[PDB]
Amino acid sequence: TTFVALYDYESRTETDLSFKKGERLQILNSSEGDWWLAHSLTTGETGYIPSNYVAPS
Amino acid sequence: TTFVALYDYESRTETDLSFKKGERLQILNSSEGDWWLAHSLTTGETGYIPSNYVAPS
């Protein structure tokens, strides 16, 4: 249920969470799901996608 | 290896990927890993975290 930060992390966008090594973190359930780095074969664009929006080919 | 978009998705930050239903998407390997929505019990802040930066308590 609970995780611990292994390294510092500085936020890079409005939506990520900054934390320090040692912080205790609780994972939450969103409707979008986990986010994956993806490349669109249709458009050539790249970036993070919500896993719950996609299904295997 | 390949996934298909089930719904349209409009990007909300500089780092996510917009796509339309039907696009074919390839998942890529980054050093940060998959991203999870998390709540810091240490600071009370909330947002997405790189999974490879944390370990179970």
From Swiss-Prot, chains A, B:
Tissue expr: Expressed to high levels, and with a high degree of kinase activity, in certain fully differentiated cells such as neurons, platelets and macrophages. Isoform 1 is widely expressed. Isoform 2 is expressed only in the muscle.
Subcellular location: Cell membrane; Mitochondrion inner membrane; Endosome membrane; Nucleus
Record PTM text: The phosphorylated form is termed pp60c-src. S-nitrosylation is important for activation of its kinase activity.
Domain SH3 per the UniProt entry, residue ranges: 1-57
Signal peptide (UniProt feature, chain positions): none
Family: Belongs to the protein kinase superfamily. Tyr protein kinase family. SRC subfamily.
Quaternary context: Forms a complex with polyoma virus middle T antigen. Interacts with AFAP-110. Interacts with GJA1 and PXN.
Physiological role: Non-receptor protein tyrosine kinase which is activated following engagement of many different classes of cellular receptors including immune response receptors, integrins and other adhesion receptors, receptor protein tyrosine kinases, G protein-coupled receptors as well as cytokine receptors. Participates in signaling pathways that control a diverse spectrum of biological activities including gene transcription, immune response, cell adhesion, cell cycle progression, apoptosis, migration, and transformation.
Name of the protein this chain belongs to: Proto-oncogene tyrosine-protein kinase Src
Primary gene name: SRC
Covered residues, full protein: 84 to 140 of 533
